A paper describes a structure:
Residue His-132 is required for heptamer formation. Our MD-based observations thus suggest that the CTP remains bound to [name] upon proteolytic activation of the protoxin.
Residue numbers in the entry: 2 to 423, 441 to 467
Amino acid sequence: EPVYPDQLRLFSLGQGVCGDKYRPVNREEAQSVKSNIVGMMGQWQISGLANGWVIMGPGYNGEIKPGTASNTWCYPTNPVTGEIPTLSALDIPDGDEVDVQWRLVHDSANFIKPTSYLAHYLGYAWVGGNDSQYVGEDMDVTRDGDGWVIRGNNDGGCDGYRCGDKTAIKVSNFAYNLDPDSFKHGDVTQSDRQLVKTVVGWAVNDSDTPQSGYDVTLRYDTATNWSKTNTYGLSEKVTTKNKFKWPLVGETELSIEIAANQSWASQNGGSTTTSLSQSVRPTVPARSKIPVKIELYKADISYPYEFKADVSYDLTLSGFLRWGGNAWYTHPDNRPNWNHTFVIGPYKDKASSIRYQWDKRYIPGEVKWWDWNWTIQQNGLSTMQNNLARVLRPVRAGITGDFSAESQFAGNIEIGAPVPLALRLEIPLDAQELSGLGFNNVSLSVTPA
């Protein structure tokens, strides 16, 4: 009877008020799933719990403490019971696409048996080979065009009505979504921030009046370039759902964008030039000078990389449905030949979503395909739970290669304390030498703030 975080809903209806069919989450309940709630809150959010308590956002370290709030964390007065657990990922090593697929479809404990049992619990007939009396055993895995077919070996004769008609499980339409946030990196091959030049001098206030309200601005443009390799050919088909910026590693500042819906293997490098300007608005007492410095740096970095790409596929179950026991909502008794496609991965529509069908099973108007309550009655709640959690187990392929980047950047303009003379700039800049160091169109200017 745990509290299910994915059933929580926030209401903004006044002190301790919840919407219809919801009730306020109490402190014990909130504690039991604390990190999940906090992880659904804004940094400085503070939300009400029942009986004078409040739970705070991650900026407050997700504290539960007494208080009042106009918004309230709430939970179904009648929650959907026995959710399908989420299991830890199944990690498959980087490889070419065939070898990655092969590794998946030939896994007995993680793929063959779970999908077989699923076909079996749904009412599909003869999910098993002739040389075993158990479901999902003596299965034949064969390549079929761009996909794969799992199906009980059928050699020879067999005993049972229509035992020759073995149910087939076909895996197709593989896709691979790189998860930017799964980023991990090996040991930093090359790394350093080297000082290539320091621009140094003075800014002088010649007047007899404390001068201020004057900006001293350095403008310059530099190039950042980066490259990367892709260890294997799978990367030729992996994409990322949304554009993202390359992770920051080291102090070497970098601006690199990976494009959405573009072959990982097609984004192997680039160079960007950007005009940047930084300034300071110093107060310089009358008839004085202040020292000014600007450090210029070259930075580069190399390191082996690895992301995870979430592997999704369609599971098409085809075979005839057993008499006096199948899970189709009509419960057909004529042994019809049946075909159904589940999408293992990102949701596509209700008909093809085990998770959706499952969570809605107690709503008769939603039961338009499989009758999961029947599967539960026949095999038991935890049996259906453990099987589907294995069927739906996230599968992730590793995406590897080497990364390398190079940039040139200026440090901040730094100033020292005023010295009495014994806004005018005395700060030599050699355009040619700077250009040779990768800093172009460099200027230092004095203008009203």
